[PDB]
Amino acid sequence: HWGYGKHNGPEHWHKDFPIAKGERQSPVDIDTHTAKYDPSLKPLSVSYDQATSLRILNNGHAFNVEFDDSQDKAVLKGGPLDGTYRLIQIHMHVGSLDGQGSEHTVDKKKYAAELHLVHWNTKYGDFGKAVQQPDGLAVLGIFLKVGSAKPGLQKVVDVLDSIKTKGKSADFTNFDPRGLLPESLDYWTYPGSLTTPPLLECVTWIVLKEPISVSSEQVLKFRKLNFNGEGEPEELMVDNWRPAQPLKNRQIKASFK
């Protein structure tokens, strides 16, 4: 399998998934002095009104919240997107200390953590089918910076002990993902990939300019999950982020001045 350690980490990924060395790999560093402001990028349309969360899982690589995507109940539209994209999974990437944790970086600065609200293009029928298309996913990347407690993350924080080890999951209905959003919907966008195996180059990345805040106590608690299964030596799930990949001839655009 794979992970973030020295023996199964980001450097080994290409052996099982040769696309790891692709031309459109994620995450990437967002260079503020080169990213291009595009006046024709429409505003993001987040419609999470009837969102239906299902469960939270510790998959052994990160924890994730899975949603019911049987219909258009929690969708992303607008921005650089054509059509409708359904929310299926929310993943969190976190560091071992405040100075690192995010996968995307801004002028080389790593945020304490990064959330990935993974949505898939409805013209493809489903997620599995969508990851095979260059425009099958729209992933909203949201940075976390230490500050005031975020009500939305607190919902996840309260459940962390139920999913301490790999394979453990818990009911996670009535979770409103709007609570994970910053004030501003301004963003950066570029074509990229999944940041975890299979690393399929299928995503239109939408990385929000404004990080959401997380208290010290909340991040402390997010670093208490384990990569390992119950009964195996404790390996804290920290620094589960893939580093920035080669931008190639790709253009990162900004929806803001």
UniProtKB/Swiss-Prot annotation:
This is Carbonic anhydrase 2. It holds the Pfam family Carb_anhydrase. Gene3D superfamilies: Alpha carbonic anhydrase. Target of drugs used in treatments against glaucoma disorder and breast cancer. The gene is CA2. It comes from Homo sapiens (Human). Changing residue 116 to E: Strongly reduced activity. SUPFAM superfamilies: Carbonic anhydrase (SSF51069). Residues 1-256 form the Alpha-carbonic anhydrase domain.
